[PDB]
């Protein structure tokens, strides 16, 4: 019945007291957090409260679109020794920090992912060379599907792979993907091992990395420049902005205190000092 | 079963969930989900591997977290034949899905490729 945009509990007028009631007294040993409102420890006037928790609702908290990855590609000359660089990226929020930390306050979740692609470009050589408006392809290769080998192989024919042809200089590309989780909720943390070391086997064959799983495996993105080789090398960056929408979460955890190090819960040394100096008896 | 009419037998086709030792002895495969099969007038049999998996769907690839298991066939007695009968024969297998079999998230296959 209570929604987000509802007014918080109205403060009630309270006066002098001398009773067998003990609001102020608790014992945090019970695990229970003592619920004390204003009209308890002090005499408060009647206040028709107006503040609402609207903007603090789960949906609202993650209501921004974060930068998950930067993918580099180019379009080098037909005469270059190197191959036309096409980008491949493992789909994950973890690569950066921000979006990750926010997703860390909870143990689990369900959310339809909405993606954004703000592509940029530029020349590289000190040549007054020309380049026509470039076309971009964003290709979603699910787990175990043909990942491209060249910038021009049968794979990009994508008879079944959902791709996005972006024409540079237009309103950024966008797609929506629902809950593709193999579970019931995507596990931001996972206490375990994909394999179980066995006894009539060898340490090699039953060794697995702690913390990982297939849960957080969804596929990779492959981006290229659909235009062929051009007389002037034109590099390009693909920024991916992800925004969780229609979100739910389960069981809170404390936010990441120290600086990140890897996709694991691991921490590097020298970054173990989160706080600063401040006296106990000084304001 | 594709052996003569005068040939007989009993076999133990089995299915054990994953996350343990792959069984190499009847005794172990016998400890799991199996269907003891008798060879007779009804030449074919069917063992149903019911869905017993951690997730709601498994990766179509070679991944451990979503690993499937182990299917194994073993002699429950042995093959018995009389005189004037071939001592060797063949058995064909046929895999299919049960009505509750479903799939999701379409992608491209790898079983074909256009090179050049």
């Amino acid at each position, epitope marked *: 019945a209570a929604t987000s945009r509802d007014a918080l509990p109205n403060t009630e007028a309270s006066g002098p007291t001398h009773s067998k009631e003990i609001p102020a007294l608790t014992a945090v040993e019970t695990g229970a957090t003592n619920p004390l409102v204003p009209s308890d420890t002090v005499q408060t006037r009647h206040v028709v409260q107006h503040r609402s928790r609207s903007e603090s609702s789960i949906e609202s908290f993650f209501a921004r679109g974060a930068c998950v*990855t930067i*993918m*580099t590609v180019d379009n080098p000359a037909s005469t270059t020794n190197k*191959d036309k*660089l*096409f*980008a*491949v*990226w*493992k789909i994950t929020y973890k690569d950066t920090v921000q979006l990750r930390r926010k997703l860390e306050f909870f143990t689990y979740s369900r959310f339809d992912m909405e993606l954004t692609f703000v592509v940029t470009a530029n020349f590289t050589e000190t040549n007054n060379g020309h380049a026509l408006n470039q076309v971009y392809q964003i290709m979603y290769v699910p*787990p*175990g599907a043909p*990942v491209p*080998e060249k910038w021009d192989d049968y794979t990009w024919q994508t008879s079944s792979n959902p791709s996005i042809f972006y024409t540079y200089g237009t309103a950024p590309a966008r797609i929506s993907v629902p809950y593709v989780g193999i579970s019931n909720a995507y596990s931001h943390f996972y206490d375990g*091992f*994909s*394999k179980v070391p066995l006894k009539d086997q*060898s340490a*090699a*064959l039953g*060794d*697995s*990395l702690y913390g*990982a*799983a*297939s849960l957080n*495996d969804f596929g*990779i993105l492959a981006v290229r420049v659909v235009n062929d080789h051009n007389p002037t090398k034109v590099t390009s960056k693909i920024r991916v902005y992800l925004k969780p929408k229609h979100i739910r979460v389960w069981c809170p955890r404390p936010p990441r205190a120290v600086a990140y*190090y*890897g*996709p*694991g819960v*691991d921490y*590097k040394d020298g970054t173990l000092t989160p706080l600063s100096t401040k006296d106990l008896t000084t304001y | 079963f594709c052996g003569s009419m005068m040939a007989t037998g009993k076999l133990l086709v089995s299915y054990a969930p994953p996350g343990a030792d792959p069984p190499k002895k009847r005794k172990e495969a016998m400890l799991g989900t199996h269907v003891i099969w008798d060879i007779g007038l009804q030449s074919s049999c069917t063992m149903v591997v019911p869905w017993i998996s951690n997730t709601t769907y498994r990766q179509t*690839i*070679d*991944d*451990s*977290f979503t690993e499937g298991g182990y299917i194994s066939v073993f002699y429950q007695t042995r093959i018995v034949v009389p005189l004037s009968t071939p001592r060797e024969m063949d058995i064909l297998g046929f895999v299919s899905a049960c009505n509750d079999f479903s799939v999701r998230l379409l992608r491209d296959t790898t079983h074909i490729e256009q090179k050049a």
Partner: nanobody
Amino acid sequence: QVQLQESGGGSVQAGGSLTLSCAASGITYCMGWYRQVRGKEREGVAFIKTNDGTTDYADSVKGRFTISQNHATKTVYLQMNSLKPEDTAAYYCAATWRWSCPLDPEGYQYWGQGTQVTVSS
């Protein structure tokens, strides 16, 4: 489009141990499946999956080598112990996302420059 680099390789005696480092460009493990293929010419040693576990070693070296993943630095190593003269080979590192093909040298797409290791008798 990752770029490999073979570092931490050199001369040592017989019986000892040496470590090999393989840092990479990107967006590293994103091309997935890092490897260690020795031989003066071409022959595998270690193979590894960027996700999950997921080790496996060449029968010829089994139980003396280990390939590890440092996803933070983007470096894949190779701890070679109890070295023996037959270990003096041309070491390299590899990758292909294709979650399979670890038994074919020509199945790869990425290769580094290399580092000669010498198990001096």
